Amino acid sequence: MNIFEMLRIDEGLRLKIYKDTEGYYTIGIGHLLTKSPSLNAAKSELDKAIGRNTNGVITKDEAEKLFNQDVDAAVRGILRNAKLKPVYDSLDAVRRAAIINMVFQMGETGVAGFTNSLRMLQQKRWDEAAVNLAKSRWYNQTPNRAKRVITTFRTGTWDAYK
Ligand SMILES: [Cl-]
Ligand SMILES: [Cl-]
């Protein structure tokens, strides 16, 4: 298992514009298009992102391409972030995947906002961090996915995904 297969399980794959759990226009593997309510604003962003007139539909290859950019940007954002970098640096490879997953879903700002949990992860207090991570809107809104990520942090194995 690796970051790519992990996120592909959590986000799924859709070739036509859809609405995410929050109601925002998305496509492919969890690629947010816009928070705007306009389907037209969404198609416009889509065509801008792909470099062609898509009419709201893309191919598997195009979806995978957006996905490769997004994971890359996720990793680079963590490494540039003064709050995240130290945490990331301190973790083992499995747990690094867990924080990349959070960033991909909620953005760097969001994760950087989990101050207490980040401090607990850095100190390697696994059980305590898992408990604090669960007291969040994130956990309440997408409990099945949050549980998987949390278990990954608690155990340091890919069990939740097997
Ligand atoms: Cl883009
Ligand atoms: Cl969920």
Curated annotation (Swiss-Prot):
The keyword Magnesium does not apply. Changing G30A: Almost complete loss of enzymatic activity. Optimum pH is 7.3. The active site is at E11 (proton donor/acceptor), D20 (proton donor/acceptor). GO terms for cellular component: host cell cytoplasm. It is an enzyme of class 3 (hydrolase). Changing N132I: 5-fold decrease in enzymatic activity. Induction: Expressed late in the viral replication. GO terms for molecular function: lysozyme activity. The keyword Hydrolase applies. Substrate binds at L32, F104, S117, N132. Its EC number is 3.2.1.17. Pfam families: Phage_lysozyme. Changing D20C: Nearly no effet on specific enzymatic activity. Changing S117F: 10-fold decrease in enzymatic activity. InterPro entries: Endolysin_T4_type, Glyco_hydro_24, Lysozyme-like_dom_sf, Lysozyme_dom_sf, Phage_lysozyme-like, T4-type_lysozyme. Changing N132 to M/F: 2-fold decrease in enzymatic activity. One of its GO terms (biological process) is viral release from host cell by cytolysis. Its main location: host cell. SUPFAM superfamilies: Lysozyme-like. It catalyses: Hydrolysis of (1->4)-beta-linkages between N-acetylmuramic acid and N-acetyl-D-glucosamine residues in a peptidoglycan and between N-acetyl-D-glucosamine residues in chitodextrins. It is found in: Host cytoplasm. Endolysin with lysozyme activity that degrades host peptidoglycans and participates with the holin and spanin proteins in the sequential events which lead to the programmed host cell lysis releasing the mature viral particles. Once the holin has permeabilized the host cell membrane, the endolysin can reach the periplasm and break down the peptidoglycan layer. HAMAP family: ENDOLYSIN_T4. This is Endolysin. It comes from Enterobacteria phage T4 (Bacteriophage T4).
